[PDB]
Amino acid sequence: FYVPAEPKLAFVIRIRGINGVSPKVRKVLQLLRLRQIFNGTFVKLNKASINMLRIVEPYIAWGYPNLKSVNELIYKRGYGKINKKRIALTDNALIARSLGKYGIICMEDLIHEIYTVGKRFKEANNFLWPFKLSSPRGGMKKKTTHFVEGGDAGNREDQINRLIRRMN
């Protein structure tokens, strides 16, 4: 048997709203930069981040994005945090001004640094403003239960791509 490497990158979408959230879940969601429903972000997966995802499991749907998902998220909904502002990535100069010192000078560099986690994932990812996805077209199964029991919360391994196709 060939056991593939455990995935190093996750895409996390907040699926529940902001009403009646316990303080620890609230803090972890703020640390994940998911302060709104249907906000998505990339998370570099390790022990520290996974144990944070377990806390907010009822509130998020997350998984392992593929190359097409990363491409479409960056290209259609990619915005940069430039001078504390949400600026659309309409020119490579916007990426090169902020992340050029890390070798990232184009959308291709950004996509590479996200898909392969690389050395400057923290900088590139925090440069990315959190994605503001739409409501899922076609609906959700049940947002109040886990994915493995017929719902939407928690870790769906590679079905997060099916979710992404409908959410953007």
Partner: protein
Amino acid sequence: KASGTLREYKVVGRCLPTPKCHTPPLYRMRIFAPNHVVAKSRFWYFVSQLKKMKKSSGEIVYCGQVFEKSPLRVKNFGIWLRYDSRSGTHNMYREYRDLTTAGAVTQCYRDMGARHRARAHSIQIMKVEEIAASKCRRPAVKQFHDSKIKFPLPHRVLRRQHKPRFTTKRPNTFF
């Protein structure tokens, strides 16, 4: 666990290698699940009960859908299961006729829900075997072991009741 149409998954897992036993045994299970995510979850559920394994202390080295070997051959399936009722736990043997093992297990889940109000989290499939007609025991299955089987379709119900919704002619049932 919810449903859909179930598929069979061969899931092989093991404990993580430790400086006590470098090569731990590999365990294989047949899991009937809507998708491989649910299949992995149910595999961990079962091996935690059987062995002293966990998702954190172990890894899944394989998870692949098992295609039916003879999806064009009618056969009889016997299913041994255990389920939680409202007042106890029982073992059941049930029999179904199908072309696919996963289809028969889906039949079993629908039937347990219909007759015993048992949900999929209560049901726990533990054996599925293709049995012979001479080895079948349930009369509902056994009545189809007839080489010259023959029956009409007596009372055909009109199903296009709204195409047309209004009409002069009253429908016919005998065909």
